[PDB]
From a paper:
Beta2-glycoprotein I (β2GPI) is the major target for autoimmune antibodies associated with antiphospholipid syndrome (APS), an autoimmune disease characterized clinically by thrombosis and recurrent pregnancy loss. The binding sites for anionic phospholipids, lipoprotein receptors (including ApoER2) and GPIb are in domain V of β2GPI (β2GPI-DV). Circular β2GPI can be converted to an extended form by altering pH and salt concentrations, binding to a high-affinity antibody directed to domain I or by the binding to cardiolipin. β2GPI, which is abundant in plasma (about 170 µg/ml or 4 µM), acquires its prothrombotic properties only in the presence of anti-β2GPI antibodies. Anti-β2GPI antibodies create multivalent β2GPI/anti-β2GPI complexes that have pathological properties compared to pathologically inactive β2GPI monomers, which are normally present in plasma.
β2GPI binds anionic phospholipids and the A1 modules by its domain V. In the crystal structures of a full-length β2GPI in the extended conformation, domain V forms essentially no contacts with the adjacent domain. There are no glycosylation sites in β2GPI that could affect function of domain V indicating that the individual domain V (β2GPI-DV) dissected from the full-length β2GPI will function as domain V in the extended form of β2GPI. We solved the crystal structure of the isolated domain V to 1.9 Å resolution. As illustrated by Figure 6, the backbone conformation of β2GPI-DV is nearly identical to the structure of this domain in the full-length β2GPI. The largest difference between the structures is localized to a C-terminal loop. Experimental data strongly suggests that this loop is flexible in the native protein. Also, the residues in the loop are either weak or missing from the NMR spectrum of β2GPI-DV in solution reflecting its internal flexibility. The structural similarity between β2GPI-DV and domain V in the full-length β2GPI provides convincing evidence that the isolated recombinant β2GPI-DV mimics domain V in the extended form of β2GPI. We have previously demonstrated that the A1 module binds to the C-terminal part of β2GPI-DV and, therefore, the N-terminal peptide tag on β2GPI-DV and the bound anti-tag antibody will not interfere with the binding of the A1 modules to β2GPI-DV. The concentration of A1 at half-maximal inhibition was 176±37 µM for β2GPI in serum and 188±44 µM for domain V. This observation demonstrates that A1 binds circular and extended β2GPI with the same affinity suggesting that the binding site for A1 is not obscured in the circular form of β2GPI.
Residue numbers in the entry: 243 to 327
Amino acid sequence: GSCKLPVKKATVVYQGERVKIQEKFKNGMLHGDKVSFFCKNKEKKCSYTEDAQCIDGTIEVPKCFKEHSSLAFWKTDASDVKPCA
């Protein structure tokens, strides 16, 4: 079974490449599909990835994920921050 987009906007890693999930999966994800979302470590100010997989028509987004806000122009999206070591 197939999953609907779990979020509105996010850059994720799909098969090694960064894509906008809303663009690359504009028509849903297929079973087995796997992406990595980006989350922030706000103490070390670096980003880390958390994988999420479409399993029987459901894809659970990691709890640390935060949706992009166009209004928050002073905030850096997790994907744009230096990666955690």
